[PDB]
């Protein structure tokens, strides 16, 4: 009977171990959730930078066939 | 008789002690995936930043564009 809280001590022990494993593999796919959207902010701001890039160059044309 | 309720309880007390130091290292394996989780959340608010900081220098080439024509 000693056993028994010995047991219960043991089974809430596993339990608590079960409860933080699963806490693991959530926050690995809040991470991997978080990345993914770094590589997609990624290709994103290098478009913009190249649609600038060509908005200046059209500009740089534009003012030198003003002089 | 005797034997098996003293070893009984030491068999129970080391399945506890196994599973509170396997708790201690998953506690540090949840705040390595939280730490990266949130290093990559702040990578995602300064890109978001430069991306709404780029589309001004576009509106600004585009509107002298305009002009310049």
Redesign the interface.
Same mark, same amino acid.
């Given at each position: 009977r000693?056993?028994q809280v010995?047991?219960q001590?043991?089974d809430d022990?596993?339990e $608590?171990?079960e409860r933080?494993?699963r @806490?693991?593999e959530g926050?690995?796919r809040?991470?991997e959730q &978080?990345?993914a959207?770094?590589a997609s902010?990624?290709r $994103?701001?290098q478009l913009?930078?190249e @649609?600038?890039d060509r908005?200046?160059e059209?500009?740089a044309t &534009?003012?030198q066939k003003?002089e």
């Open positions: 000693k056993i010995l047991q001590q043991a022990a596993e $608590r171990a933080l494993q @806490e693991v926050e690995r809040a991470r &978080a990345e959207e770094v902010l990624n $994103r701001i913009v930078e @649609e600038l908005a200046q059209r500009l &534009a003012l003003l």
